Ligand binder design. Structure first.
Ligand SMILES: *[C@@H]1O[C@H](CO)[C@@H](O)[C@H](O)[C@H]1NC(C)=O
Ligand SMILES: *[C@@H]1O[C@H](CO)[C@@H](O)[C@H](O)[C@H]1NC(C)=O
Ligand SMILES: *[C@@H]1O[C@H](CO)[C@@H](O)[C@H](O)[C@H]1NC(C)=O
Lengths: 681, 49
């Protein structure tokens, strides 16, 4: 195989508002002959071309001849754009040197089509809404008004809608990931075994998964259950290490998670029912005769989980576990804790805060065993309304809070917030005895889509645990893949500007995705549907922010370089010191949040080495290869510092700074930004 | 596994495990597991064999 020509281009990068970056073209000859090659670029009015070599053409080169061919351009649009360049060799031009054959094969002219991405100005976000219309052989309609424009940015706000009932899950690329006994700290054993348990339910039920690896996961669990035998308490409770703390209770998330799968896993190796009923009588002894018991919870415990330590939600955690054992007075006990939860549910009905984490998981499952849970099918709609989500996930930002207290969507819990929410939400969806064809099924299919789209089994997710929990969603949907859905649904999408696009859904459009956008600055979405069964349609309004925002209590102490380039060798190598700590770190969840990215045309080499070196008393040495993660440590203020440099990939650049800031410390206050750009420019 | 054992010594000793859970701690789990073992063997109607 051989070709006497090839193109080396400039992969620009997700680039900045100033679109004048550097773009060149370098065509090189490997055949020993000299050949002329005319060159031009197929352009369009979508961007503002500026000719550098306006008057003279990059003309003619020979064997191993080097020529840079670059132009200037300052586009107006945003998004993926492909530049179509062409280069052709002609005949009868023996004047560059002595001779030009210029007779190639059917690959006559050289052309390249380079899709370059451009990042819009400022920081990107959205604000979606959630809407449900389900007539029973009739018609229901609603209006959605989409307006929150404070401190707008020019030409960023757009939107779209969709609805789905997806079947046809792709494949199993990401189901393969592994970890082992913590070399560093045994405290991580809790977050080890908490997800490894339900791998039992994932072997056959998927039909796509690789059950070899979960069959090995149960091999690890054959030691895990002995660790639990060693992590138990004599009285019946559980902790990180076990007994010698007698008169006290322990966390119930992991024991409630694991007791049902000990009941399903008492087949391979025998665990007696004594081990279940001792935990049970431990659950039974703590209940008062009249009162909803007190339980002071240690909040921000890195070993166990990150939460809010609301003792009533723990009183509900015991009872989701009680719901399994078929004792029939146990169900009156879960009714008592359901009255405590009814306190919590009125707190939810106010719609201000119930921590948005726990009752979500428990309300469905408590009644999903019984079979009269249409009330819970109704509250799961309210759970679905509580999300600023992508088409399948949540990314970053609650809309425009005037109200100070918000429960849990942009807390220091930062596994990107989509997985640990959507997982328990799907657990809530499809535990139903009756045919769940109604909106819960459709939303479950909405969740499964991006889970199937994750075609990377790395394990270097935005988080580190939650890739384990993401495989709950695809897996439990394996049995729910069989259903009956598709009706005389005729959807109508209208807005103020005399526009009306019609849509329809059936059993063959059950899996069809409808994407349609509108560019109007007003936002209004009146809908009208028909048919039978209940299905949920979703919105998404993408828009950038942060042209220039004020300073705020957070202290991102970033230092770029010694105050300027002011020299011919700078603008390439300059180490950026960052020293950061929000003093607010009190009792939310393990240190999870960080974002640090590269500005447009700068590549990291040594930063990787430094981060590999960094460790603050405890560490996971997690990485993204454009970011850095050394944060997981105990409750402490008193920041540290660093320095990391780059190299110049972009020779020329227009003026606007790139910035990489995520910031979540407490809910009452403003979310506390702090910034400083790059001075060399 | 699927068989019972003599009850003279366990019946003799369970009450004094309840009296002897003061010096060194035996949990009530150890009592109630023997108890549920005593409870599982009873038929609904018959005097078990
Ligand atoms: C540009 O390239 C992208 C990425 O493959 C592709 O999706 C798009 O269709 C291309 N546009 C064309 C053909 O100009
Ligand atoms: C395997 O999983 C399927 C659902 O995917 C379920 O219907 C079946 O009962 C499971 N076990 C068997 C019998 O194959
Ligand atoms: C934070 O700084 C304070 C300063 O008084 C210090 O007492 C504390 O140990 C530091 N870490 C914690 C516990 O937040």
């Amino acid at each position: 195989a051989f070709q006497p020509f090839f193109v080396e281009l400039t992969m620009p990068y997700s680039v900045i508002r100033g679109e004048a970056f550097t773009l060149k073209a370098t065509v090189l000859n490997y055949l020993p002959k000299c050949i002329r090659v005319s060159v031009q670029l197929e352009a369009s009015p979508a961007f503002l071309a500026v000719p550098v070599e306006k008057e003279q053409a990059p003309h003619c080169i020979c064997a191993n001849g080097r020529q840079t061919v670059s132009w200037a351009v300052t586009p107006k649009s945003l998004g993926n754009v492909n530049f179509t360049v062409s280069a052709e060799a002609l005949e009868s031009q023996e004047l560059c040197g002595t001779e030009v054959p210029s007779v190639p094969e059917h690959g006559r002219k050289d052309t390249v089509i380079k899709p370059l991405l451009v990042e819009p100005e400022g920081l990107e976000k959205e604000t979606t809404f959630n809407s449900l219309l389900c007539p029973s052989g009739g018609e229901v309609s609603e209006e959605l008004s989409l307006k929150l424009p404070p401190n707008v940015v020019e030409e960023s706000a757009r939107a779209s809608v969709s609805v789905l009932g997806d079947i046809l899950g792709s494949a199993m690329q990401n189901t393969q990931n592994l970890l082992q006994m913590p070399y560093g700290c045994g405290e991580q054993n809790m977050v080890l075994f908490a997800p490894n348990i339900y791998v039992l339910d994932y072997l056959n039920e998927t039909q796509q998964l690789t059950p070899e690896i979960k069959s090995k996961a149960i091999g690890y669990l054959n030691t895990g259950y002995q660790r639990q035998l060693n992590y138990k308490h004599y009285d019946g409770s559980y902790s990180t290490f076990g007994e010698r703390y007698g008169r006290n209770q322990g966390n119930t998330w992991l024991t409630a998670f694991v007791l049902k799968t000990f009941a399903q896993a008492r087949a391979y190796i025998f665990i007696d029912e004594a081990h279940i009923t001792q935990a049970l009588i431990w659950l039974s002894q703590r209940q008062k005769d009249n009162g909803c018991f007190r339980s002071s919870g240690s909040l921000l415990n890195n070993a166990i989980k990150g939460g809010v330590e609301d003792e009533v939600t723990l009183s509900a955690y015991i009872t989701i576990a009680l719901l399994e054992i078929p004792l029939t007075v146990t169900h009156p006990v879960v009714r008592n804790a359901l009255f405590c939860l009814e306190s919590a549910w009125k707190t939810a009905q106010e719609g201000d805060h119930g921590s948005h984490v726990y009752t979500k998981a428990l309300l469905a499952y408590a009644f999903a065993l019984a079979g009269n849970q249409d009330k819970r099918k109704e509250v799961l709609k309210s759970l679905n309304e509580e999300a600023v989500k992508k088409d399948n996930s949540v990314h970053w930002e609650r809309p425009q809070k005037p109200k100070a207290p918000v429960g849990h969507f942009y807390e220091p819990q930062a596994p990107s917030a989509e997985v640990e929410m959507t997982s328990y939400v799907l657990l809530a969806y499809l535990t139903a005895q009756p045919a769940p064809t109604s909106e819960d099924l459709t939303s479950a299919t909405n969740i499964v889509k991006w889970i199937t789209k994750q075609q990377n089994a790395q394990g270097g997710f935005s988080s580190t645990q939650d890739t384990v929990v993401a495989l709950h969603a695809l897996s439990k949907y394996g049995a729910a893949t069989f259903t009956r859905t598709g009706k005389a649904a005729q959807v109508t999408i209208q807005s103020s500007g005399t526009f009306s696009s019609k849509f329809q859904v059936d059993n063959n459009n059950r899996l069809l995705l409808q994407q349609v956008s509108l560019p109007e600055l007003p936002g209004e979405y009146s809908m009208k549907v028909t048919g039978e069964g209940c299905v949920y349609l979703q919105t998404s309004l993408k828009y950038n922010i942060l042209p220039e925002k004020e300073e705020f209590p957070f202290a991102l102490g970033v230092q770029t370089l010694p105050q300027t380039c002011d020299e011919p060798k700078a603008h390439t190598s300059f180490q950026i010191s960052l020293s950061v700590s929000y003093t607010g770190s009190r009792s939310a969840s393990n240190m999870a949040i960080v974002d640090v990215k590269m500005v447009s045309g700068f590549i990291p080499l040594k930063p990787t080495v430094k981060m590999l070196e960094r460790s603050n008393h405890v560490s996971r040495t997690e990485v993204s290869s454009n970011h850095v993660l050394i944060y997981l440590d105990k409750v402490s203020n008193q920041t540290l510092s660093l320095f990391f440099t780059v190299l110049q990939d972009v020779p020329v650049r227009d003026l606007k700074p790139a910035i990489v800031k995520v910031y979540d410390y407490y809910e009452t206050d403003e979310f506390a930004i702090a910034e400083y750009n790059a001075p060399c420019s």
